[PDB]
Symmetry: C3
Subunit: 340 residues, 3 copies
């Protein structure tokens, strides 16, 4: 909600309270999304100030407050800053920003990250260029310096992040993306490669000294219709865990497919149909293993722009004999969102 | 403070900074409220959007930021989300919301939770239906579908919450409350019962497979006068700790009484007089033991609606030979509140 | 940003997103400021309500959200409440507030805490009266009851804070400051002494039962020019660590000097030149050792009041044979700030 706007500076304070609950059988240990209360809230700000006609400064922060913890010792479980960055946009020269933000390969995966509650399985956090990461400097150009309507690109520099955990770490790397949008149609190509840290290399699963990730996407976005598809692959970048051995590391190789089809009725109802499948290849020990594999059917109903509710239903196709221990049960999420 | 209100959506961003200090003798280990700096702040939002004349969507989040921690490792001590839920209210049909919110038995205990700094001792957090809990779906009806002015009820479904701690856990249960308000007078009755988790049962104190809590309340609220009284009981629901043995669990049984008398002078001064006593029965090993027992005398002075200061004084009636180790010293809280 | 102002109550919600990165060689273990992503954000509120013509109530809270943590287990690293207090100001009688706030000796050190990214090295947190501490009650008087323009003083009472750590702890103490400002010129004198806790005394380094800190400051602030200087000393108050022995405690004695010279060009550029040196005397075992010692050259460029960027460069004068293990390498900070 734009709570402030004076002297060329406008501040949008935004947030939401999401009552949420997952239904899966058993202790949801073997299901797709788990089970039980998953309530949470978000609070963030996006500011933008016009330094002059061609120059704009801007910043953004967003935090995640779990609403399913007790007020006891576990009270902070799941809380975190999702985004934190500042930047400048100059005329048709492009924008530049630095901070915790989205990796460039997500310029592609974004296409199918449209499910009511699930989806976007391959867009992991602190996992190089596919989701939100810290220490990324991003340059973006729109309409090719204003010379080509619809042609955009981006290059991104990822600074080394040596964390206590191999999962949340990364070495230096570069990434880029090129996309093109013509009247409802959009196509993207994105790619990044980075150094792996000592600790990532000291891991049991996955083998290499460089991580890679690319994804391409195609979409048709117009006339109440949204159809999108993604295909990408990765080398030693996707994190996996053998639940049996309690071993961990990264998939040597994966091939990822994501399809989404949705329609927005005029009265508020937006049905969703989706398909996801990410399979790992050459896992040291297992061979080829599915990591994610399911059909999604769900629907969101918008009361207006501040209120909505939805049911997301995962029809898990993973099978009980999955070598890594990946869960095979179904999950149903029901939620009620208020937002501003 | 209502910082936003356009297109039927109004956002109230609220909060407070409370400079607070407790005075108790010794290391306040044996006193009622402890001793020393207890400064803290609150930040929350309450939004409400009119989807149409009969339908309203709404959400709320509130957080607690301790102001008495260092900026060192202990910096997060005491921080937590207090409330987080979204919901809908439809015409005279009632409201429904889901998230971290107040258990229904507090519809009763609320009556006497009016002290300047203390009071409301029996309304514990993450303790089934008496205080704030996670994963509660609540239906509330006002004026009996609009057919009976002043007659309200509520039913609430509590979802299992298996936490790492027996204190912060709960099984599934249902609760309800009926209250009636006629011209300054109000009466309430509230009740809930729930399953106890394995871990709650594995505890040294308390014995059963079901937790119960009911409370009734009576109040006279008009003419600058506020007089209220509560009486309730519980089975295996109230958490207790033997300080000697360092044993823990729940009271098999308790009987709780709370009385409050206050007056609001026209110039800002609101004196308070209260009495509280909660006694546990059949504690495995001790027999009957008082858990809370005191007189309260205090006063709040309102400079206006954003500024106030108060002194709350607990005249502890617990005695030094209390079998559980419950403290017997007095405590005096002084505080200065700014809020919006 | 003043997001609210009605009925004599105005709320200023403020914050910033700072994309930040440090450049130091090696693993920045031996450099002055470290190395890598240091992105972060701030969110705070300052409220003020006019109770009547002579009386004002007010409160403030400010929090620090690190933007360089993953969304994993380390997500909360560095987060904390910086300030949290409420208070009243009455006519020319003075103001009083209580909560987590700035120690009075900082009324002096503030003079030179003006560097783009570094500086203010002696103004440690939870370190008695020099930086932000919890449980301080502060009385401030301006213009000597309105009888002497430019003459101000303050007295401050610090309540004992027994934390789990000797570094973040303190006993009771009192502090005061007197300053005088005449047309661009300002002079200050500040002083405080406090009890040290058992745990502080149980430490390997430093010896005494009372901590002291005083600093004097001189400044010339006018005509786009800012020149300031500080000199202060401390007894058993400054925290130090022998990196070799991994020993810790407080410096028996230190002598601190800080000089700053800056100029604000009309077009937005504010160059900075500074010098800092804090040396410990009588360290048990080492003798005299420098703790901080460097030249700073840097510059901030203001796009407007909401957007700026800067480069701060530390020319470390500490030498590689520093007895405590204090780092000797240089550090360069580059940052881009959006704020409101
Ligand atoms: C505003 C500061 C930007 C700092 C960018 C640092 C990038 C470091 O490594 C990039 C490797 O690719
Ligand atoms: C909007 C989602 C509501 C989900 C309610 C789940 C209730 C589960 O158990 C209740 C037991 O009583
Ligand atoms: C508004 C409450 C103020 C409480 C101040 C307590 C000060 C305690 O010790 C001070 C020692 O000097």
């Amino acid at each position: 909600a734009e709570i402030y706007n004076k002297d060329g500076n406008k501040v949008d304070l935004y947030g939401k309270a999401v009552g949420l609950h997952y239904f899966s059988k058993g202790n949801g240990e073997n299901s797709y999304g788990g089970n039980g209360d998953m309530t949470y809230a978000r609070l963030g700000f996006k500011g933008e100030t016009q330094i002059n006609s061609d120059l704009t400064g801007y910043g953004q922060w967003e935090y995640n407050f779990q609403g399913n913890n007790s007020e006891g010792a576990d009270a902070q479980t799941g809380n975190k800053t999702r985004l934190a960055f500042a930047g400048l946009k100059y005329a048709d020269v492009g924008s530049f920003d630095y901070g915790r933000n989205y990796g460039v390969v997500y310029d592609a995966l974004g296409y199918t990250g449209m499910l009511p509650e699930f989806g976007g399985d391959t867009a992991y956090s602190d996992d190089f260029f596919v989701g939100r990461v810290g220490g990324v400097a991003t340059y973006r150009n729109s309409n090719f310096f204003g010379l080509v309507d619809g042609l955009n690109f981006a290059v991104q520099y990822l600074g080394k992040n040596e964390r206590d955990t191999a999962r949340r770490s990364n070495g230096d790397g570069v990434g880029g993306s090129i996309s093109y949008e013509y009247e409802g149609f959009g196509i993207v190509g994105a790619y990044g490669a980075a150094d792996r840290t000592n600790l990532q290399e000291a891991q049991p699963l996955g083998n290499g000294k460089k991580a890679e990730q690319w994804a391409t996407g195609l979409k048709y976005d117009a006339n109440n219709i949204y159809l999108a598809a993604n295909y990408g692959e990765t080398r030693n970048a996707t994190p996996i865990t053998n639940k049996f051995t309690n071993t961990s590391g990264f998939a040597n190789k994966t091939q990822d497919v994501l399809l989404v089809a949705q329609y927005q009725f005029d009265f508020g109802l937006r049905p969703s149909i989706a398909y996801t499948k990410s399979k790992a290849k050459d896992v040291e020990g297992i061979g080829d293993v599915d990591l994610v594999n399911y059909f999604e059917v769900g629907a969101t109903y918008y009361f207006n722009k501040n209120m909505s509710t939805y049911v997301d239903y995962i029809i898990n196709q993973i099978d009980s004999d999955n070598k890594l221990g990946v869960g095979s049960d179904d999950t149903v999420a029901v939620g009620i969102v208020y937002q501003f």
